[PDB]
Amino acid sequence: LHMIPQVAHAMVRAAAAGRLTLYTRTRTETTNFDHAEYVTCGRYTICAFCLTTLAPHANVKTIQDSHACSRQPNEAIRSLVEVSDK
Amino acid sequence: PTGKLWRPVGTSVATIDSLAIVSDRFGQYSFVNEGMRETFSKALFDINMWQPLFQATKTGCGPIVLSSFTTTTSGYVGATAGDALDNPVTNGVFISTVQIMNLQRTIAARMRDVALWQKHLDTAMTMLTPDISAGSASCNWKSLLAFAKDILPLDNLCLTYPNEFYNVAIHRYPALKPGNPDTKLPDAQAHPLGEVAGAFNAATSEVGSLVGSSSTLSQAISTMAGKDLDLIEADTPLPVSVFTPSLAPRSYRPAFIKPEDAKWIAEFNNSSLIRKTLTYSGATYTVQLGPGPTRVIDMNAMIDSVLTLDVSGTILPYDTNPDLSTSVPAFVLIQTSVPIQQVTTAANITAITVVSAAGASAINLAINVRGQPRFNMLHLQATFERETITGIPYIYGLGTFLIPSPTSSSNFSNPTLMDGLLTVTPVLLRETTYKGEVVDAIVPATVMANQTSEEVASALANDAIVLVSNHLNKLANVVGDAIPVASRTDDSATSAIVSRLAVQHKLSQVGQASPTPPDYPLLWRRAKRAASMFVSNPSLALQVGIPVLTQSGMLSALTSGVGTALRTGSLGKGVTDASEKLRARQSLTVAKQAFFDQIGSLWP
Amino acid sequence: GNVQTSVNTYNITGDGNSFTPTSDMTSTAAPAIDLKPGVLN
Ligand SMILES: *C(=O)CCCCCCCCCCCCC
């Protein structure tokens, strides 16, 4: 029960009125999901690789983490943002 | 002597090197000094007591004599060859390691055995308060027994062994006096194994209770030396450590705290509004800094803590200005170029970071509670760190709103969510904060009568004030507890202060007509309420404008009095109001005698 | 309360027993035995 599903209820509600800033490993925001690791609302922050909650403050410039992979997809929330960004 | 026993390994001549811990197949014999036998005897004594229940239930294995775990070796016994050389002991009584093991696991195994029975004996014993504290009071035995024959639930152990528990009991309750076999009558005196101890716990009518009054003193003495109540108003740098600040996370309500009432919180007092923008998660929001002054947590003077601004139950008027709804509330830092309180318009605000936004706009976080939609209890929360703000002269934490589109409706709103109950928790005790600066040492005396009414209640969790308050608070419970600062007894506390008022009012009279000879009946009484007002609300001694209490003498004075006062209480300190206290105990025994009278009738 | 006889020097239902608290002898075994490191040795 790592995920804490009150967090995931904040993921989807930030997806619908898309906010969902996608941040890379060099703490810059992109919209492509390929170079991006951190996922915000901006309440909660989750690295897309390990898929764990990191900080409730977003502004991911102040987060320490050590993970490295090439997976955690659902891209579906990422896809739902750009549709709802219009 | 003490420690393990040693013996001349080189034989005969025992020098500071021809020794060696006499170890062997049993482990090392450690000496059993006089007092350490008191314990193991006192422990075994409390087990032997349960002898009648060990045989009854075929457990146990005979009485445990401490003389079965020891030996009678002889040699030099110390902590090290060097010092063991000065303790030649002959035929001392040592207990070998492997033995120090059994006397241990035996007292442990037996301790379980009895701990159990001893629990059954109790639910039955205390189940008829065999303890009064004034005069006597009987309860005809027949009834008593025929009564518990009932109450006691079918799974006790006092029903399976009545006079197998009774014999254990007689030695613990000098209430139950067994009827002597050859005169078939009681004994007047009751002889329970705890003969002395039980004699010295009775609430002696002369003075409350020696066992009580004695401890309430040694207890206070502990604190007095411990925390460091002594030196409470010392005038010189003291490491925060000296204040053992722990479990210390205070919560507020900013956006209310005046900036001058607490340095760690400045405000944007500017004419118009200061709508700024910032791309947060793609979407562009506008921080407002609305109509009012919008008090914001300053970042400097903010001991790297864990700021957790809770926004709940607080109003959320998205009903009127629709502008408010849609905006995700979020705690955001704000770096300004020109110092705040001088920051006029948007071009002044360097940048704005959303350190922690709330997913989902202001229309899901709501909840209607009679028209006025409130905020569903949620906690936004940064983790400010001393150095993440290095260089940056101006930066402020602000729990604002982040409106997705400013409008005319939100022209008098001012979205500061600071009205919420923010809870800062210093996450790095070593560093404190004072008057707006971060330090590593306080100067106690400085913080006395230096805060204002609310320059105290507005203190920042683990800051000098909150530390020079946590401290007085201990010293406040030592007096409140041990010393009698709550009766007309002009105690040692209110007495230390009176001597200061005199010496003080006496020199202020020196030079000039001296038309007023010091009072004293009025001084004693003035200092009595001064020492009393302190015990009452320890805090006050920090607020500017408190009679007596805030002069440099007092406190520094008080404590050092209260100090020596505890180190002399005697034992019979309980003599204070030991009259009404006594008369109240007789009052209880008269009512409890009334109880035994029914146990005595109902169950004849 | 059935008669026993020798197991223990006193019968419970024995002749002339007597429950009777006296403010004078507060019943107490040995709970506060000191064992802390410094104090036990
Ligand atoms: C026979 O066992 C009848 C019941 C009488 C005594 C049972 C236990 C209640 C009285 C306790 C006596 C020992 C200490 C309470």
DSSP string, B325-338: TTPPPEEEEEE-SS
List CB contacts of B431: < 8 A, sequence separation 6 or more: B240, B303, B304, B386, B438, B439, B440
- Containing H/E element for B266? strand B265-267
Please name which of B446, B451, B449, B444 lies closest in space to residue B468, comparing C-alpha atoms. Answer: B444
Boundaries of domain holding A32:
1-86
Task: Give me the number of domains chain A comprises.
Answer: 1
Domain B209-227+463-577 has CATH 3.40.50.1390: no
DSSP class of B373: B
- For domain B237-462, give the CATH superfamily: Membrane penetration protein mu1, Chain B, domain 4 (2.60.120.420)
CB B255 within 8 A of CB B419: yes
| B202/B175 Cα distance (integer angstroms) | 12
Nearest 5°: the CA angle B293, B282, B294 is 5
Please name which of B460, B465, B467, B491 lies closest in space to residue B478, comparing C-alpha atoms. Answer: B491
| B405/B382 Cα distance (integer angstroms) | 25
| B389/B273 Cα distance (integer angstroms) | 26
Encoded tokens for B177: 């006096």
Please name which of B446, B435, B401 lies closest in space to residue B419, comparing C-alpha atoms. Answer: B401
For residue B128, the ligand 1 atom closest to its alpha carbon is: 15
Q: Do chains A and C touch (3 or more CB pairs under 8 A)?
A: no
Report the amino acid identity of residue B80.
T
Q: Do chains B and A touch (3 or more CB pairs under 8 A)?
A: yes
CB B190 within 8 A of CB B175: yes
Residue B89 phi, psi dihedral angles, 5° rounding = -115, 130
B141 to C15: CB separation less than 8 angstroms, yes or no: no
Q: Which ranges constitute the DSSP H helices of B79-180? A: 81-84, 97-125, 141-151, 162-169
Please name which of B292, B253, B285 lies closest in space to residue B269, comparing C-alpha atoms. Answer: B292
Residue B308 phi, psi dihedral angles, 5° rounding = -130, 90
CB B540 within 8 A of CB B465: no
Please name which of B570, B484, B569, B579 lies closest in space to residue B205, comparing C-alpha atoms. Answer: B579
- Containing H/E element for B27? strand B27-28
Q: How was this structure determined?
A: cryo-EM
CB B330 within 8 A of CB B380: yes
Question: Which residue(s) pair with B334 in the sheet?
Answer: B352, B396
CB B135 within 8 A of CB B202: no
| A18/A39 Cα distance (integer angstroms) | 12
Question: Which residue(s) pair with A36 in the sheet?
Answer: A24
List CB contacts of B372: < 8 A, sequence separation 6 or more: B315, B317
Sheet containing B395-400: give its strands across. Answer: B265-267, B295-298, B395-400, B330-335, B351-357
Q: How far is B220 from chain C (nearest CA, A)?
A: 19
| B358/A58 Cα distance (integer angstroms) | 9
A57 to B388: CB separation less than 8 angstroms, yes or no: no
| B530/B203 Cα distance (integer angstroms) | 33
CB C22 within 8 A of CB B175: yes
- Please classify residue B435 by burial: count the beta carbons closer than 10 Å to its beta carbon, then call 0-12 exposed, 13-18 middle and 19+ buried: middle
CB B512 within 8 A of CB B599: no
DSSP class of B224: I
CB A48 within 8 A of CB A75: no
| Other residues' Cβ atoms within 10 Å of the Cβ of residue B98 | 12
Please name which of B21, B27, B18 lies closest in space to residue B4, comparing C-alpha atoms. Answer: B21
List CB contacts of B420: < 8 A, sequence separation 6 or more: B253, B309, B310, B311, B312, B314, B375, B399
| B243/B464 Cα distance (integer angstroms) | 10
Strand pairing report for B27-28 and B23-24? antiparallel
- Residues in B closer than 8 angstroms to C18, CB to CB, are 138, 141, 176-177, 179, 186
| B151/B144 Cα distance (integer angstroms) | 11
| B464/B439 Cα distance (integer angstroms) | 9
Q: Does B335 touch chain A (CB under 8 A)?
A: no
CB B32 within 8 A of CB B2: no
Query: Where are any strands of DSSP class E within B401-506?
Result: 422-423, 432-434, 437-439, 441-442
